Amino acid sequence: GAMGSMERASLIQKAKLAEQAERYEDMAAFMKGAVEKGEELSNEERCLLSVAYKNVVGGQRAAWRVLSSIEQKSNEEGSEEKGPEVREYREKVETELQGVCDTVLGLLDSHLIKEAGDAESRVFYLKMKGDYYRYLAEVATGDDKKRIIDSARSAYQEAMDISKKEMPPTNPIRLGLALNFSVFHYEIANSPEEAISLAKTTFDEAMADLHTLSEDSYKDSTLIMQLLRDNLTLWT
Amino acid sequence: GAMGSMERASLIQKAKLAEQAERYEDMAAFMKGAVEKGEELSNEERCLLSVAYKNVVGGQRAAWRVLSSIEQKSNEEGSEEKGPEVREYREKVETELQGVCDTVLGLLDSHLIKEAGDAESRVFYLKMKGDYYRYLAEVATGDDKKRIIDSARSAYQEAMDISKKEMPPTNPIRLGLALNFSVFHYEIANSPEEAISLAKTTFDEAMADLHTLSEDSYKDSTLIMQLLRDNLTLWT
Amino acid sequence: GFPATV
Amino acid sequence: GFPATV
Numbered sequence: 001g002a003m004g005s006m007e008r009a010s011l012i013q014k015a016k017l018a019e020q021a022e023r024y025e026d027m028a029a030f031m032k033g034a035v036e037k038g039e040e041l042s043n044e045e046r047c048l049l050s051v052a053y054k055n056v057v058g059g060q061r062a063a064w065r066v067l068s069s070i071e072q073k074s075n076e077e078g079s080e081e082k083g084p085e086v087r088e089y090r091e092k093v094e095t096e097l098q099g100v101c102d103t104v105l106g107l108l109d110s111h112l113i114k115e116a117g118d119a120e121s122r123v124f125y126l127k128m129k130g131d132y133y134r135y136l137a138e139v140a141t142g143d144d145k146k147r148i149i150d151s152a153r154s155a156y157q158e159a160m161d162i163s164k165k166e167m168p169p170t171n172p173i174r175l176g177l178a179l180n181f182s183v184f185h186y187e188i189a190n191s192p193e194e195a196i197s198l199a200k201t202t203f204d205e206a207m208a209d210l211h212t213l214s215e216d217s218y219k220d221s222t223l224i225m226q227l228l229r230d231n232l233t234l235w236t
Numbered sequence: 237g238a239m240g241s242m243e244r245a246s247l248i249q250k251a252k253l254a255e256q257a258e259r260y261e262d263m264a265a266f267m268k269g270a271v272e273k274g275e276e277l278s279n280e281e282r283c284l285l286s287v288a289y290k291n292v293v294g295g296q297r298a299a300w301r302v303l304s305s306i307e308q309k310s311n312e313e314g315s316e317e318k319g320p321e322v323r324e325y326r327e328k329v330e331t332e333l334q335g336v337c338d339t340v341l342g343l344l345d346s347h348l349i350k351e352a353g354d355a356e357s358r359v360f361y362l363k364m365k366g367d368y369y370r371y372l373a374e375v376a377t378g379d380d381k382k383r384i385i386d387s388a389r390s391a392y393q394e395a396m397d398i399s400k401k402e403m404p405p406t407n408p409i410r411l412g413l414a415l416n417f418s419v420f421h422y423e424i425a426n427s428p429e430e431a432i433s434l435a436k437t438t439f440d441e442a443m444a445d446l447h448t449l450s451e452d453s454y455k456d457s458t459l460i461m462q463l464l465r466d467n468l469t470l471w472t
Numbered sequence: 473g474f475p476a477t478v
Numbered sequence: 479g480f481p482a483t484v
């Protein structure tokens with residue numbers, strides 16, 4: 001790794017600097033270096049890792065969607081043939097996105113998940129595993145598409161099972177997991193009713209547990225509950 | 237060049253796609269490939285080249301300024317020593333920025349400027365040469381700082397001399413050149429009075445020539461005149 | 473109209 | 479308060 005010669009603590013410090021500078025590719029490379037030191041990550045370090053990669057892949061997904069839209073319009077009837085360029089460039093962005101997903105999935109498999117014994121770390125990493133299989137599923141078309149979809153579902157389901165046993169219903173990781181698994185159901189699995197049921201049940205169970213929280217915990221939980229409500233409003 | 241095997245027209249088409257997808261690094265790599273085909277660029281292609289690199293280097297400059305600010309605060313009295321990391325990472329971003337500037341300057345010197353005989357192409361390229369020396373000057377500290385500053389000034393001055401002889405005072409390239417040379421005077425050369433005089437004289441001479449323009453030309457010229465007025469308002 | 477994820 | 483350039 002090009003980060004092999006840098007101290008773990010310096011990689012973490014530079015990931016925080018890169019975040020402040022909105023240099024998300026650098027932030028992700030610093031956090032990949034920190035993971036590859038082999039030690040478990042703290043709560044804050046897991047957040048740094050997730051923020052870095054979510055921003056990199058989020059930009060790739062946005063560009064992929066622009067290009068896929070142009071490609072679809074170029075393939076309608078009455079459209080003038082523009083040659084292979086739109087497909088080639090959509091494929092280039094798609095292959096880069098798939099590479100970033102495979103990199104994150106590789107960090108999770110070697111060896112973040114297997115060393116994660118506490119619920120807050122294991123649920124976080126299994127949620128990320130579902131997320132990056134979900135991003136692969138967004139662009140998948142081949143023999144492996146169903147297996148990619150099922151890998152996302154399986155990771156999300158394991159995270160859900162642990163979160164329901166080990167975390168309160170307002171825990172922000174449990175809420176964010178449910179938000180994203182609900183989006184998986186709606187957008188990937190063609191299961192809008194399951195998406196809506198999961199979002200509603202998650203919101204209602206969190207609502208009933210807010211009375212137990214401090215003001216700071218309440219702010220974190222209600223932020224995610226508002227996103228569940230936003231999605232429910234989009235879908236109903 | 238990694239773009240050597242792609243058709244010129246396909247490089248231009250992909251630069252336009254990359255722009256739509258806000259993938260400015262790709263856009264710049266496609267346009268570098270197109271320049272390296274060795275043919276002169278059209279007006280639209282020059283715009284694509286300039287937009288691509290202005291967006292790449294603009295992001296680098298913004299990140300450099302964030303990091304340089306953190307570095308300066310870390311070096312004040314009473315600040316806790318955080319070690320070499322802030323300087324190292326500012327240096328990394330600085331070296332990347334300098335590499336992009338050297339790449340653009342190299343395209344201009346090999347061989348865009350020497351083949352540019354019409355005023356609209358030659359002024360455009362000499363303005364870009366001043367711009368990328370100006371970005372080098374923003375980060376320069378060594379034995380060569382004065383020469384970097386003078387290379388920017390010399391390129392801007394040649395562009396100004398051609399633009400005053402060969403273009404009307406409302407021409408948007410002549411206006412954009414003057415806007416940026418005025419910023420050079422204010423921010424780089426420590427010459428705020430020259431910056432203000434150039435902005436005012438440029439604005440007034442354009443105002444007096446707007447009556448000659450069509451509605452479309454008027455919109456382009458007044459857009460840049462508003463930026464001159466914005467800077468004058470900031471500076472006075 | 474893309475849905476919210478975290 | 480950075481000045482405008484094009």
Ligand SMILES: *SCCNC(=O)C(C)(C)Oc1cc(F)cc(F)c1
Nearest residue numbers: 046047050172173174176177220478
């Ligand atoms: S890990 C980033 C800090 N937490 C958040 O910003 C918040 C409240 C949205 O919670 C989550 C963030 C996140 F990236 C994943 C989660 F499951 C929750």
Ligand SMILES: *SCCNC(=O)C(C)(C)Oc1cc(F)cc(F)c1
Nearest residue numbers: 282283286408409410412413456484
């Ligand atoms: S080349 C981009 C098209 N023109 C513009 O957007 C406008 C009107 C701002 O003019 C200039 C742009 C540019 F990049 C450089 C110029 F000198 C003018």
Ligand SMILES: [Mg+2]
Nearest residue numbers: 006007008009
């Ligand atoms: Mg060590």
Ligand SMILES: [Mg+2]
Nearest residue numbers: 194197198201
């Ligand atoms: Mg259920």
Ligand SMILES: [Mg+2]
Nearest residue numbers: 242243244245
């Ligand atoms: Mg050819």
Ligand SMILES: [Mg+2]
Nearest residue numbers: 430433434437
């Ligand atoms: Mg004068």
